[PDB]
Point group: none
Chain length 73, copies 6
Amino acid sequence: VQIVYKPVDLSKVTSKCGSLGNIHHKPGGGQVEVKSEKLDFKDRVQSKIGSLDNITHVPGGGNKKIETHKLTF
Amino acid sequence: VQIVYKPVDLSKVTSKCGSLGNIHHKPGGGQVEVKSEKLDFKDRVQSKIGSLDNITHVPGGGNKKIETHKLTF
Amino acid sequence: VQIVYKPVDLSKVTSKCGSLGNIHHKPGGGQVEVKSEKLDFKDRVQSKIGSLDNITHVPGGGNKKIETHKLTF
Amino acid sequence: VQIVYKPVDLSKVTSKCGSLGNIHHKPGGGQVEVKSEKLDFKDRVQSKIGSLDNITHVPGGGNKKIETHKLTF
Amino acid sequence: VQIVYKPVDLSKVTSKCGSLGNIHHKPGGGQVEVKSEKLDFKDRVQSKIGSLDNITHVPGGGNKKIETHKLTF
Amino acid sequence: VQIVYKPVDLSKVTSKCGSLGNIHHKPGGGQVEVKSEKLDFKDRVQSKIGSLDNITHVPGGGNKKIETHKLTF
């Protein structure tokens, strides 16, 4: 057994923008009500309960590069 | 047994923006109401309960590079 | 037994922004209410309960590079 | 010439209620945008422009008695 | 010329309620914008512009009696 | 010329309420924005511009009696 792991990457995940703006985000309020008796959360739970969240997200470039490199024996 | 791990990366996640602005985030309030008896959370739980959260996030470049490199026997 | 781990990175996660500004964040209040009897949290819990949080986040470059390098037997 | 004006009133505008309640008014927000250039008003105008009004009105008795008594020559 | 004006009133506008309550008024916020250039007003105008008004009005008896009595020559 | 003006009133605008309470008024914020160049007002104007007003009004008896008695020549 010989193993060689040698991937090569020269990629561009690039963006170009001339001018970014005039972005208006005017939410109008709202209402949320949640009822329960018991919550029981185990092992890697992610939760929102009862949320009224407003987000403006304006990256001048929002580029994502995501990788997994893996071996197993 | 022999193993070699030499992955190579020369990548660009780069951005260019000429001018960024005139961004207006103006939430209108809101109402949130949550009821329960018992909350019981175990092992790596992430939780929001009853939130009214406002975010303006304007990164002049918001580029993300995420990598996992991993051997395992 | 022989193992060589020698990954190589010459990458750029850079940004350029020509001018950043004219950002307005004007929240409008709100109301939040939460009820319970018992909270019981064990092992690596992250929690918000009852929040009314406003965030302005304007990094002139907000680039993030995240790496995990690992071996295990 | 003799004029006699003599209304007689012995009326009941009465109400009876045994128990009044469990009234829930839960408005869900909203949005309004009014545009105009020139507004000009004269003589006994009542006006409302661009409104998001919420009213709960729970009189334990909500009776009205309204009269005009008038002579003219 | 002889004129007599003798209205007679023995009227009841009376109310009775046994118990008044459990009233919940819970507005969800909201958003209003009004744009204009020139406003000009003369002689007995009543005006409201750009409002987000919340009213709970719970009179234990809310009775009205309104009268105009008039002579004119 | 003979005039007699002599109205008689023995009226009751009275109320009874046995118990008054458990009233909750919980506004959720809001947002208001008014724009203009020139405001100009003459003679008996009542005006409200750009309001976010919250009113709880709980009179244990809230009765009104309004009378106008008038002569003119």
